[PDB]
From a paper:
In this study, we have determined the crystal structure of a full-length apo-Mpl protein from the permafrost bacterium Psychrobacter arcticus 273-4, PaMpl (UniProt accession code Q4FVQ2_PSYA2, locus name Psyc_0032, 505 amino acids) at 1.65 Å resolution and have also biochemically characterized this enzyme. The crystal structure of PaMpl was determined by Multi-wavelength Anomalous Diffraction (MAD) phasing to a resolution of 1.65 Å. PaMpl is present as a monomer in the crystal asymmetric unit. The final model includes Gly0 (a remnant from cleavage of the expression and purification tag); residues 1–209, 216–265, and 285–504 of the protein (the full-length protein contains 505 residues); and 588 water molecules. PaMpl can be divided into 3 distinct domains: the N-terminal UDP-MurNAc-binding domain (ND, residues 1–102), the middle ATP-binding domain (MD, residues 103–357) and the C-terminal tripeptide-binding domain (CD, residues 358–505). The CD is a six-stranded, mainly parallel β-sheet (β16–β21) flanked on one side by α-helices H14-H16 and 310-helix H17, and on the other by H18–H19. These 3 domains are linked contiguously to form a triangular-shaped molecule with dimensions of ∼56×60×47 Å3. The largest conformational difference is in the disposition of the CD in Mpl, which is rotated 30° relative to ND and MD, when compared to its disposition in MurC (respectively). The corresponding residue in PaMpl is His210, but this region (residues 210–215) is disordered in our structure, probably due to the absence of metal ions. A loop (residues 404–414) from CD in PaMpl is folded into part of the ATP and UDP-MurNAc binding site. Structure analyses indicate that the orientation of the CD domain of PaMpl relative to the other domains is flexible and changes on substrate binding.
Residue numbers in the entry: 0 to 209, 216 to 265, 285 to 504
Write the structure that this text describes.
Amino acid sequence: GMHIHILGICGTFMGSLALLARALGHTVTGSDANIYPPMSTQLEQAGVTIEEGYLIAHLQPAPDLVVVGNAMKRGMDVIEYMLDTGLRYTSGPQFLSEQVLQSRHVIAVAGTHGKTTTTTMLAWILHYAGIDAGFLIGGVPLVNTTDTNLQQVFAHSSYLGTEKDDSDNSVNTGYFVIEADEYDSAFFDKRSKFVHYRPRTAILNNLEFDDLDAIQTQFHHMVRMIPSTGKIIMPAATISLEDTLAKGVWTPIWRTSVIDNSSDWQAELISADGSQFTVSFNDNKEATALVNWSMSGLHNVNNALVAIAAAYNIGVSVKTACAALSAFAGIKRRMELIGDVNDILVFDDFAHHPTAITTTLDGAKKKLADRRLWAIIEPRSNTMKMGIHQDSLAQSATLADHTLWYEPTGLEWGLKEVIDNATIANPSIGSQQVLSSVDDIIKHICTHAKAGDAIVIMSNGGFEGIHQRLLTALGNIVAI
């Protein structure tokens, strides 16, 4: 039971590590510039102690280990103190790899689009099927049933799950579902998650652009390590993915196809909108069933098919997996309406990178018709760039009427420049500004938004508690 201190602990990824660490029995403290919900509340309930600011005093007394988030850099007092005093430190992904993943059969999902859709669907299938899989993913499914076990499992976007059972062979457990992405390296360990994580089942969800080689290289770093007895699951007929494998692969492939190096798994559409389809696996005549769900779109069918195949790889029948997805209620923080104040609609969405922001805003425009649309975005900060041109963030917000981006004071990372440079170079990407205070963003909205408008808040986490702070402010405006 070590004492672990986490720098940046209120953010989704690092907070997830804190929660997993507590579940392991560790004592967990942390620092963040702000303490904000929903993660603060989850941390507090788990018995984590959070302190405000990045202060040397937070590392007194000395913890056994410091887990360092991506925003930390040299020149910061707490970091210079850490290095001078010789405290032990590690990155988030290395900590997770050593403390949780090493002992599990890890299922990692990579892709340019829809990674969290696929991981939420997969984690749902596993738990529906009675497999007590751990996970650290980008969101959670909505749980509409009165099943209090599924309610508790999906209370957080992290869950430890159980270890492979040493005595009872009837139990199928010891798994961990995770997203492979370009985030959460640290200043002293620039290895990506594609290098850190060692999945035995890997999904390559897709590989497309709304630097191909940079993305293929990163995917390759994960593919090239999978054991010979593992499985790679990906869509068929996708040259960008076939070329990824061609760099070096030692593991059997299952290829997936949605029909309306040939495929092993097929989803045949019954309803053109993707709300109903049959799933079949070529090597098992019984491995066929129907999905009849409240989701739609070809991307969601593709996501379902790779999730079903991955679950089949670890024992879930096609029948059970398809029953699970037929019961899938959707995903929290996917254009989720959280307020309607003075006729201003407020939505919450987990999009935090260009392809996700694009998809969310496409959906928002289809939904909201002619309403004036405000995008309020905290993109997920990162010291590294992967495949996406600098202009990608600004381009992704083209469909909004107004966009307010957030870059935090003291942890600036070049956002204002990438946006401002993009809007000069391509005026068609419209009206966008980068602000340095959540208070200024809220004031801007309260000041300029009017009855009929819609606001879409986008962040991988709590965005310094902007959600309730905005709803409160909007409800306090004195009408004329």
